Short mmCIF file of all heavy atoms in Angstrom, two decimals:
data_model
loop_
_atom_site.label_atom_id
_atom_site.label_comp_id
_atom_site.label_asym_id
_atom_site.label_seq_id
_atom_site.Cartn_x
_atom_site.Cartn_y
_atom_site.Cartn_z
N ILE A 1 -57.41 -42.88 -20.56
CA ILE A 1 -57.53 -42.75 -19.11
C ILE A 1 -58.41 -41.52 -18.80
O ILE A 1 -58.94 -41.40 -17.70
CB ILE A 1 -56.19 -42.74 -18.37
CG1 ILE A 1 -55.35 -41.53 -18.77
CG2 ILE A 1 -55.42 -44.05 -18.61
CD1 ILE A 1 -54.32 -41.06 -17.66
N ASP A 2 -58.49 -40.58 -19.75
CA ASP A 2 -59.31 -39.36 -19.63
C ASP A 2 -59.47 -38.83 -21.05
O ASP A 2 -59.10 -39.55 -22.00
CB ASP A 2 -58.68 -38.33 -18.65
CG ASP A 2 -57.37 -37.68 -19.08
OD1 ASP A 2 -56.99 -37.85 -20.22
OD2 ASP A 2 -56.71 -37.05 -18.22
N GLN A 3 -59.97 -37.61 -21.23
CA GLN A 3 -60.19 -37.09 -22.57
C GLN A 3 -58.92 -36.65 -23.33
O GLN A 3 -58.99 -36.38 -24.54
CB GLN A 3 -61.20 -35.93 -22.53
CG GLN A 3 -62.61 -36.36 -22.08
N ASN A 4 -57.75 -36.62 -22.64
CA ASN A 4 -56.50 -36.14 -23.24
C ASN A 4 -55.43 -37.20 -23.42
O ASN A 4 -54.51 -36.97 -24.19
CB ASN A 4 -55.91 -35.01 -22.37
CG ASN A 4 -56.80 -33.81 -22.34
OD1 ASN A 4 -57.43 -33.48 -23.34
ND2 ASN A 4 -56.83 -33.13 -21.19
N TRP A 5 -55.50 -38.28 -22.65
CA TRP A 5 -54.41 -39.27 -22.57
C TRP A 5 -54.86 -40.66 -22.92
O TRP A 5 -55.86 -41.15 -22.36
CB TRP A 5 -53.79 -39.31 -21.14
CG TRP A 5 -53.16 -38.00 -20.72
CD1 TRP A 5 -53.80 -36.92 -20.17
CD2 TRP A 5 -51.79 -37.61 -20.90
NE1 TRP A 5 -52.90 -35.87 -20.02
CE2 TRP A 5 -51.67 -36.27 -20.48
CE3 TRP A 5 -50.64 -38.27 -21.37
CZ2 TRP A 5 -50.45 -35.59 -20.49
CZ3 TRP A 5 -49.42 -37.60 -21.36
CH2 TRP A 5 -49.36 -36.25 -20.97
N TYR A 6 -54.03 -41.34 -23.72
CA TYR A 6 -54.16 -42.78 -23.92
C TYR A 6 -53.17 -43.52 -23.04
O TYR A 6 -52.07 -43.03 -22.82
CB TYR A 6 -53.77 -43.19 -25.34
CG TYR A 6 -54.78 -42.92 -26.43
CD1 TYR A 6 -54.37 -42.36 -27.64
CD2 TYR A 6 -56.11 -43.30 -26.29
CE1 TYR A 6 -55.28 -42.20 -28.69
CE2 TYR A 6 -57.02 -43.14 -27.33
CZ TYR A 6 -56.61 -42.55 -28.51
OH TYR A 6 -57.53 -42.42 -29.53
N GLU A 7 -53.53 -44.70 -22.61
CA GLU A 7 -52.60 -45.68 -22.04
C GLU A 7 -52.30 -46.63 -23.23
O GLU A 7 -53.22 -47.01 -23.99
CB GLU A 7 -53.27 -46.47 -20.92
CG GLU A 7 -52.31 -47.44 -20.26
CD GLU A 7 -52.89 -48.16 -19.06
OE1 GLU A 7 -54.14 -48.26 -18.95
OE2 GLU A 7 -52.09 -48.50 -18.17
N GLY A 8 -51.05 -47.04 -23.37
CA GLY A 8 -50.67 -47.94 -24.44
C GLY A 8 -49.26 -48.42 -24.29
O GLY A 8 -48.68 -48.41 -23.19
N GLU A 9 -48.68 -48.82 -25.42
CA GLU A 9 -47.35 -49.42 -25.41
C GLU A 9 -46.47 -48.86 -26.49
O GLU A 9 -46.93 -48.66 -27.61
CB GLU A 9 -47.47 -50.95 -25.57
CG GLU A 9 -48.35 -51.66 -24.56
CD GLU A 9 -48.15 -53.16 -24.44
OE1 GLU A 9 -47.23 -53.70 -25.09
OE2 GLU A 9 -48.93 -53.79 -23.69
N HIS A 10 -45.16 -48.72 -26.19
CA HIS A 10 -44.15 -48.28 -27.17
C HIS A 10 -42.83 -48.94 -26.76
O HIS A 10 -42.45 -48.89 -25.58
CB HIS A 10 -44.02 -46.75 -27.20
CG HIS A 10 -42.86 -46.24 -28.02
ND1 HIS A 10 -41.68 -45.89 -27.42
CD2 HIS A 10 -42.77 -46.01 -29.35
CE1 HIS A 10 -40.89 -45.45 -28.39
NE2 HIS A 10 -41.51 -45.52 -29.57
N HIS A 11 -42.14 -49.54 -27.73
CA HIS A 11 -40.85 -50.23 -27.47
C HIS A 11 -40.91 -51.19 -26.26
O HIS A 11 -39.98 -51.22 -25.46
CB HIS A 11 -39.71 -49.21 -27.27
CG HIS A 11 -39.27 -48.53 -28.52
ND1 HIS A 11 -38.22 -47.64 -28.49
CD2 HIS A 11 -39.71 -48.66 -29.79
CE1 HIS A 11 -38.06 -47.24 -29.74
NE2 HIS A 11 -38.95 -47.79 -30.55
N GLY A 12 -42.03 -51.86 -26.10
CA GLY A 12 -42.22 -52.83 -25.03
C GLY A 12 -42.45 -52.27 -23.64
O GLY A 12 -42.37 -53.00 -22.64
N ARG A 13 -42.72 -50.97 -23.57
CA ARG A 13 -43.02 -50.31 -22.30
C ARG A 13 -44.47 -49.86 -22.30
O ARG A 13 -45.01 -49.55 -23.36
CB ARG A 13 -42.13 -49.09 -22.12
CG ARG A 13 -40.63 -49.40 -22.06
CD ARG A 13 -39.72 -48.20 -21.89
NE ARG A 13 -39.73 -47.71 -20.52
CZ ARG A 13 -39.07 -48.25 -19.49
NH1 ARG A 13 -38.31 -49.34 -19.67
NH2 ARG A 13 -39.15 -47.71 -18.29
N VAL A 14 -45.10 -49.87 -21.13
CA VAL A 14 -46.49 -49.44 -20.99
C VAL A 14 -46.53 -48.09 -20.27
O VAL A 14 -45.78 -47.85 -19.31
CB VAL A 14 -47.34 -50.48 -20.21
CG1 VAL A 14 -48.80 -50.04 -20.12
CG2 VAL A 14 -47.26 -51.85 -20.88
N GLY A 15 -47.41 -47.20 -20.72
CA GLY A 15 -47.59 -45.91 -20.05
C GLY A 15 -48.54 -45.05 -20.82
O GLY A 15 -49.18 -45.52 -21.77
N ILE A 16 -48.62 -43.78 -20.47
CA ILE A 16 -49.54 -42.88 -21.11
C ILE A 16 -48.88 -41.88 -22.01
O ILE A 16 -47.70 -41.56 -21.86
CB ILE A 16 -50.45 -42.15 -20.11
CG1 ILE A 16 -49.64 -41.36 -19.08
CG2 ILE A 16 -51.46 -43.10 -19.45
CD1 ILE A 16 -50.53 -40.43 -18.20
N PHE A 17 -49.69 -41.32 -22.92
CA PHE A 17 -49.19 -40.33 -23.87
C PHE A 17 -50.41 -39.57 -24.44
O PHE A 17 -51.54 -40.06 -24.31
CB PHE A 17 -48.41 -41.02 -24.99
CG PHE A 17 -49.15 -42.14 -25.65
CD1 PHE A 17 -49.97 -41.90 -26.75
CD2 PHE A 17 -49.10 -43.43 -25.14
CE1 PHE A 17 -50.66 -42.96 -27.37
CE2 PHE A 17 -49.79 -44.47 -25.75
CZ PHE A 17 -50.60 -44.21 -26.84
N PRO A 18 -50.22 -38.36 -24.94
CA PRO A 18 -51.39 -37.58 -25.40
C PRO A 18 -52.05 -38.18 -26.63
O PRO A 18 -51.41 -38.53 -27.64
CB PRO A 18 -50.76 -36.22 -25.76
CG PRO A 18 -49.45 -36.18 -25.01
CD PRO A 18 -48.97 -37.59 -25.12
N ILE A 19 -53.41 -38.19 -26.57
CA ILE A 19 -54.24 -38.65 -27.69
C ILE A 19 -53.87 -37.84 -28.94
O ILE A 19 -53.72 -38.39 -30.04
CB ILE A 19 -55.73 -38.43 -27.33
CG1 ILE A 19 -56.14 -39.39 -26.24
CG2 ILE A 19 -56.61 -38.60 -28.60
CD1 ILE A 19 -57.51 -39.18 -25.60
N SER A 20 -53.75 -36.51 -28.76
CA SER A 20 -53.44 -35.63 -29.89
C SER A 20 -52.07 -35.81 -30.50
O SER A 20 -51.79 -35.23 -31.55
CB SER A 20 -53.61 -34.18 -29.46
OG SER A 20 -52.72 -33.86 -28.41
N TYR A 21 -51.18 -36.61 -29.87
CA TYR A 21 -49.84 -36.74 -30.42
C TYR A 21 -49.72 -37.96 -31.33
O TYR A 21 -48.61 -38.23 -31.80
CB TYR A 21 -48.80 -36.85 -29.29
CG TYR A 21 -48.31 -35.52 -28.77
CD1 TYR A 21 -49.19 -34.49 -28.43
CD2 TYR A 21 -46.95 -35.30 -28.54
CE1 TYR A 21 -48.73 -33.29 -27.89
CE2 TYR A 21 -46.49 -34.12 -27.98
CZ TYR A 21 -47.39 -33.11 -27.67
OH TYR A 21 -46.96 -31.94 -27.09
N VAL A 22 -50.82 -38.71 -31.52
CA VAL A 22 -50.75 -39.90 -32.37
C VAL A 22 -51.86 -39.90 -33.38
O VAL A 22 -52.90 -39.26 -33.21
CB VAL A 22 -50.77 -41.23 -31.56
CG1 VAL A 22 -49.61 -41.31 -30.55
CG2 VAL A 22 -52.10 -41.50 -30.89
N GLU A 23 -51.71 -40.73 -34.41
CA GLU A 23 -52.70 -40.97 -35.44
C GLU A 23 -53.08 -42.45 -35.38
O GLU A 23 -52.20 -43.30 -35.59
CB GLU A 23 -52.17 -40.64 -36.82
CG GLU A 23 -53.05 -41.26 -37.87
CD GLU A 23 -52.75 -40.95 -39.32
OE1 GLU A 23 -51.57 -40.72 -39.66
OE2 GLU A 23 -53.70 -41.09 -40.12
N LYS A 24 -54.32 -42.77 -35.06
CA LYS A 24 -54.80 -44.15 -35.04
C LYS A 24 -54.77 -44.66 -36.48
O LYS A 24 -55.32 -44.00 -37.39
CB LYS A 24 -56.20 -44.20 -34.42
CG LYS A 24 -56.57 -45.52 -33.77
CD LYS A 24 -57.94 -45.44 -33.09
N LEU A 25 -54.12 -45.82 -36.74
CA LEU A 25 -53.90 -46.38 -38.10
C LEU A 25 -55.12 -47.08 -38.75
O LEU A 25 -55.12 -48.30 -38.94
CB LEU A 25 -52.68 -47.33 -38.10
CG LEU A 25 -51.32 -46.72 -37.76
CD1 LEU A 25 -50.26 -47.78 -37.71
CD2 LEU A 25 -50.93 -45.62 -38.72
N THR A 26 -56.08 -46.28 -39.21
CA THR A 26 -57.35 -46.73 -39.80
C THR A 26 -57.39 -46.91 -41.33
O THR A 26 -58.34 -47.52 -41.84
CB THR A 26 -58.47 -45.79 -39.36
OG1 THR A 26 -58.04 -44.44 -39.56
CG2 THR A 26 -58.87 -46.00 -37.90
N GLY A 27 -56.40 -46.36 -42.05
CA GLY A 27 -56.36 -46.42 -43.51
C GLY A 27 -56.00 -47.77 -44.10
O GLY A 27 -54.99 -48.37 -43.73
N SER A 28 -56.84 -48.26 -45.02
CA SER A 28 -56.63 -49.51 -45.72
C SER A 28 -55.67 -49.29 -46.87
O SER A 28 -55.64 -48.23 -47.49
CB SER A 28 -57.95 -50.08 -46.25
OG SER A 28 -57.71 -51.16 -47.13
N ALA A 29 -54.90 -50.35 -47.16
CA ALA A 29 -53.97 -50.49 -48.28
C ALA A 29 -54.65 -50.20 -49.62
O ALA A 29 -54.02 -49.63 -50.48
CB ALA A 29 -53.37 -51.89 -48.30
N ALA A 30 -55.96 -50.49 -49.75
CA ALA A 30 -56.70 -50.24 -51.00
C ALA A 30 -56.68 -48.77 -51.40
O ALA A 30 -56.53 -48.47 -52.58
CB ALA A 30 -58.13 -50.73 -50.88
N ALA A 31 -56.78 -47.85 -50.43
CA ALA A 31 -56.71 -46.43 -50.71
C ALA A 31 -55.30 -45.96 -51.10
O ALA A 31 -55.16 -44.83 -51.59
CB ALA A 31 -57.19 -45.65 -49.49
N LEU A 32 -54.26 -46.81 -50.87
CA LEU A 32 -52.86 -46.43 -51.13
C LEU A 32 -52.36 -46.82 -52.49
O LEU A 32 -51.25 -46.42 -52.87
CB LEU A 32 -51.91 -47.08 -50.11
CG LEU A 32 -52.29 -46.87 -48.65
CD1 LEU A 32 -51.38 -47.64 -47.77
CD2 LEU A 32 -52.27 -45.42 -48.28
N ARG A 33 -53.14 -47.62 -53.25
CA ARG A 33 -52.71 -48.12 -54.57
C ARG A 33 -52.90 -47.07 -55.68
O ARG A 33 -53.67 -47.25 -56.65
CB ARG A 33 -53.37 -49.46 -54.92
CG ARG A 33 -53.01 -50.60 -53.96
CD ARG A 33 -53.56 -51.93 -54.49
NE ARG A 33 -52.99 -53.05 -53.74
CZ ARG A 33 -53.56 -53.63 -52.68
NH1 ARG A 33 -54.78 -53.25 -52.29
NH2 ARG A 33 -52.94 -54.60 -52.01
N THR A 34 -52.18 -45.96 -55.55
CA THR A 34 -52.31 -44.79 -56.41
C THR A 34 -50.98 -44.15 -56.68
O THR A 34 -50.00 -44.37 -55.94
CB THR A 34 -53.19 -43.68 -55.73
OG1 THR A 34 -52.48 -43.09 -54.63
CG2 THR A 34 -54.51 -44.16 -55.24
N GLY A 35 -50.98 -43.29 -57.70
CA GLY A 35 -49.81 -42.51 -58.06
C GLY A 35 -48.86 -43.22 -59.00
O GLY A 35 -48.78 -44.44 -59.01
#
């Protein structure tokens, strides 16, 4: 909605929350097949 806030969904509710408080889930499973 601006440079600080995302609009989105959590537990079936819609609203805003800080961009900095979340991590966008971009990592592929291929990078996790380790250890």
Side-chain angles (χ1 to χ4, degrees), residues 1-2 4-23 25-35:
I1 63 153
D2 68 10
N4 295 324
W5 298 84
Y6 283 135
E7 183 175 23
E9 304 198 6
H10 171 262
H11 287 183
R13 298 180 76 79
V14 182
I16 58 171
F17 52 90
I19 290 171
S20 61
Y21 273 48
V22 302
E23 164 175 30
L25 297 176
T26 48
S28 169
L32 309 175
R33 298 188 168 94
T34 71

